[PDB]
Write a protein that binds this DNA or RNA. Structure first.
Ligand SMILES: Nc1nc2c(ncn2[C@@H]2O[C@@H]3COP(=O)(O)O[C@H]4[C@@H](O)[C@H](n5cnc6c(=O)[nH]c(N)nc65)O[C@@H]4COP(=O)(O)O[C@H]3[C@H]2O)c(=O)[nH]1
Ligand SMILES: [Mg+2]
Ligand SMILES: [Mg+2]
Length: 90
RNA sequence: GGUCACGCACAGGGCAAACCAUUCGAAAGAGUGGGACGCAAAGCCUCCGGCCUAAACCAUUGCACUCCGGUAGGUAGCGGGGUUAUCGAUGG
């Protein structure tokens, strides 16, 4: 069930999108070349983030290394992406 | 002459985008002064659609790459609608 993208939920929702990406990017750049980080704060898509990696191995690396990680007072709930991104599926 | 539409003007004007200064605001943004991009209602009003904001409240653990909660505020120079008003092409 591995994927280029990893799905994080259970995040402090009152963190601004602009800032939020960077906070993850600094934490997650260390595993591979991140193509893009998708973050929204709409009713459905808040408190959660998608991180797209260059390598699938790098997404696996990030997943098994930081599960439950205390991030903004909250544990990081990471799981694989069920479906790839529109930028990958091509 | 009203009145209701119309804008090809005349004459008298009026308002003031951006930007800057300053104040308020969490922000969008607004106030004031300077400034003029434009505007025949660019006068005034959030009732209706859009767009902008997200500090606090309230709900949501939620799988996206169209965008989307209530709540609240903003935009009348985003339309729509409302309401008042000016000049008057041998004007219609
Ligand atoms: N008195 C009067 N005259 C009218 C009216 N409608 C049309 N006109 C005449 O027609 C010209 C052009 O009007 P416009 O195409 O709406 O274009 C206008 C308009 O967009 C703008 N403007 C001037 N005054 C006002 C105003 O009080 N309100 C608004 N919204 N726009 C204005 O400047 C442009 C040129 O205006 P002008 O040099 O005065 O020249 C005007 C004026 O001579 C009206 O309701 N009243
Ligand atoms: Mg004139
Ligand atoms: Mg509205």
């Amino acid at each position: 069930r591995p994927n280029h993208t990893i799905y994080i939920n259970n995040l402090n929702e009152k963190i601004k999108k602009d800032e939020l990406k960077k906070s993850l990017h600094a934490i997650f750049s260390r595993f591979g070349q991140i193509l893009d980080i998708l973050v929204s704060r709409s009713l459905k898509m808040r408190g959660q983030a998608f991180v797209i990696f260059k390598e699938v191995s790098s997404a696996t690396n990030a997943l098994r290394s930081m599960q439950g990680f205390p991030f903004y007072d909250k544990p990081m709930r990471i799981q694989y992406a069920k479906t790839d991104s529109d930028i990958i599926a091509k």
